[PDB]
């Protein structure tokens, strides 16, 4: 399984952002709104291939979560679809970026702003977000935002759609890597 | 699902589909409720799940 692939929890479907590790322990990153209140994660709709269990979740305020792999056999590619990822980096205005998600696949665009606040309502407010003109649709949450071989962010939310165009905000990946003490591989 | 508090400037993008009265499958409640507003209250919920 790689970045962008579907992940299923008891509640719904999200997308895997990036495969990471600390020492000999492997995990994956995804959106915190996906890990919130989720325990177990599976690789298929059937819930027959177990991936692991939630280890952390930060939402609202931030939008990152992390799942510890419990499945020994499933291959864990440090990629995004077949695109290799070798580092993480901070986003910048006008940076060309690409998103991959389980519903829409890969779409590209640019970073239009930094430090945005996004109000999802009901007290769910997230801060420090990267704004881009890349579209995203339901099921794409937590998928990777990358640039080249650089990990950039995790899909959080936005508006519009892929047919007419839209705006997507991502969580900076560096901040998530730092909080959990993990790294891309 | 009640959409009174809509619209919302943005929606998270997890997938838990609802089936609209326009036979469209809406990927999540936020997406659906924003479409109700945009419809000016003409779109309704058919059932939960894919259409």
Curated annotation (Swiss-Prot), chain A:
Bridged cysteine pairs (disulfide): 14-34, 135-162
Keyword terms of this UniProt record: Disulfide bond, Hydrolase, Protease, Serine protease, Signal, Zymogen
Group of enzyme by EC: hydrolase
Catalytic activity: Hydrolysis of proteins with trypsin-like specificity
Entry keyword tRNA-binding: no
GO MF terms held by the record: serine-type endopeptidase activity
Role noted for this protein: Has a primary specificity for large aliphatic or aromatic amino acids.
UniProt name for this protein: Streptogrisin-B
Lineage of origin: Bacteria, Bacillati, Actinomycetota, Actinomycetes, Kitasatosporales
Part of the whole protein covered: 115 to 299 of 299
UniProtKB/Swiss-Prot annotation, chain B:
Domain Kazal-like: 1-51
GO cellular component, one term: extracellular region
Carbohydrate-modified residues: 40
Site entry (Reactive bond 3 for chymotrypsin, elastase, proteases A and B, and subtilisin), positions: 13-14
Keywords associated with the record: Disulfide bond, Glycoprotein, Protease inhibitor, Repeat, Secreted, Serine protease inhibitor
Keyword presence, Lipid biosynthesis: no
Main localization category: secreted
Disulfide bonds: 3-33, 11-30, 19-51
Localization: Secreted
GO molecular function terms noted in the UniProt entry: molecular function inhibitor activity; serine-type endopeptidase inhibitor activity
Domain notes: Avian ovomucoid consists of three homologous, tandem Kazal family inhibitory domains.
The protein's name in its UniProt record: Ovomucoid
First and last residues shown, out of full length: 135 to 185 of 185
